[PDB]
């Protein structure tokens, strides 16, 4: 029975909300991103009205087969009217296709719902930047002090350097970066790009960086393993076991595989930097772990609050224990003394 923090007041409208059947009284089911634990049970057979972005569509038309007729892309940075009330989708800077989505109510109410988000200054400098909220439902992922890492493009460089390096050391080396839904795109891309290499996956995976509005995708990525010295593999496979038979696979062109695997936050981050990280080795092959978050830090997210001054905020993530809202509830008013408001 759908929580009451995936429903919108005074609309017909739930976000996030496909694991429930039907909805009493739900107009319209809005999609923030195309992961699972969002979209779950979203199929052919769902025949409500969906409004997502572009890429969050051309995802549920291609992978899950949903039919034209119900999806509903929105452009971004747009005011638009959706049953009689005002939506704007804005950017999340978490996976291609997530957005955050600003709702108008009737009343004069003002909700913004994050979805999954990074927050960033650049943030400021949008629609939301022109007036006053009222809710927040916030992604609290990773609302406590403990969570720093680093920014995404320092991560970046660590990889694309490290890359580079063991490549031209040893050209025979093959590169690998695990994954299991979209987002963390940017890790392989730039690492193929640095190398002069196209991106090696398999069809499934293939077809779905087809959907993303990639600027000249078809010359980036490919399915022949064989011509293609950055390869994609599951997250499950990322271990000696299955790198070995990886490499077996592979006929005898590749002599050694450096990995990466990008892990969210990892207690390893409150001690060691990202310039001093070193992997674990068993014999031809090195597996790195690197902190390539999609969430918002303690600092970013507090910093977003302090800057957008709601008079409510409702958290979207670690709710169900008693702890974890009780803790969220203490630095949330930590952040308002802070700062007056
Ligand atoms: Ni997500």
């Known amino acids: 029975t759908c929580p009451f923090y995936k429903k919108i007041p005074g609309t017909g409208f739930t976000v996030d909300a496909f694991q429930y059947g039907v909805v009493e009284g739900c107009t319209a089911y809005f999609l923030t991103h ?3 634990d969002h979209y779950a049970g979203l199929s052919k057979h769902f025949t409500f009205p969906v409004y997502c972005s572009e890429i969050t569509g051309n995802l549920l038309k291609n992978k ?3 039919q034209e007729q ?3 892309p929105l452009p ?3 005011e638009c009217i959706v049953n009689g009330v005002k939506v704007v989708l804005l950017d999340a800077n978490h996976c291609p296709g997530a957005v ?3 709702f108008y109510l009737p009343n004069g109410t003002v909700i913004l719902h994050t979805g999954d988000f990074r927050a960033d200054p650049s943030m400021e400098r949008s629609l939301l930047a022109d007036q006053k909220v009222h809710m927040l439902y916030l992604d609290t992922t990773y609302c406590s002090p403990e969570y720093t890492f680093p920014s995404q493009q320092e991560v970046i460089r660590f990889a694309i350097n490290t890359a580079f390096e063991a490549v031209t050391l040893n050209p025979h080396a093959l590169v690998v ?6 987002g963390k795109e940017k890790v392989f891309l730039a690492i193929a790009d640095v190398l002069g290499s196209k991106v090696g996956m398999s069809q499934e995976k293939y077809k779905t960086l087809q959907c993303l509005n990639i600027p000249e995708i078809n010359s980036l990525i490919t399915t022949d393993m064989c011509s293609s010295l950055v390869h994609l593999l599951p997250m499950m496979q990322i271990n000696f076991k299955g790198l070995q038979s990886h490499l077996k696979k592979c006929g005898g062109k590749y002599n050694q595989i450096l990995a990466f695997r990008p892990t969210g936050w990892t207690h390893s981050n409150k001690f060691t930097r990202i310039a001093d990280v070193i992997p674990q080795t068993k014999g031809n092959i090195s597996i790195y772990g690197i902190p390539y978050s999609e969430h918002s830090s303690y600092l970013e997210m507090k910093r ?3 800057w957008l001054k709601p008079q409510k905020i409702i958290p979207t993530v ?4 008693w702890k974890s809202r009780s803790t969220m509830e203490k630095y949330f008013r930590e952040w308002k003394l802070e700062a007056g408001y």
């Open 304 to 306: 977003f609050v302090q």
């Open 177 to 182: 970066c695990g994954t299991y839904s979209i």
């Open 34 to 36: 195309f992961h699972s």
């Open 64 to 66: 899950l087969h949903v």
């Open 76 to 78: 971004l940075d747009t």
């Open 70 to 72: 119900y999806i509903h």
């Open 100 to 102: 955050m989505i600003l």
């Open 318 to 321: 670690n709710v169900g224990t």
